[PDB]
């Protein structure tokens, strides 16, 4: 169906952008430098370039809902659905991903050499098959 649901989450002061491909459950995540509109759109545009996205479901905060993001999503032909943080219409799935992801990161932290490596293993655990 091409719907992705995204949010940022925080881990020890680092910012992690997370997406779930709604129809399959596939999880994507990347550490991003700052929680800002510019940094968020840069990371989203490249996800959009790599995957065939028809709709993006986000919260309504200034990092996901702003004129730059609006322009990118309109140029890319992506419908934008949004609502308050944690809302069940556009954020239910990724909220629960974020809770689970960060438990896995905690599990892998002592088993890895960096947060980025712990994140990769956490995402692999969520995607495991």
Swiss-Prot record:
TM regions (residue ranges): none
Gene from which this protein is expressed: pol
First-to-last residue of the parent protein present: 904 to 1031 of 1124
Protein's name according to its UniProt entry: Integrase
Record-annotated Integrase catalytic domain positions: 2-129
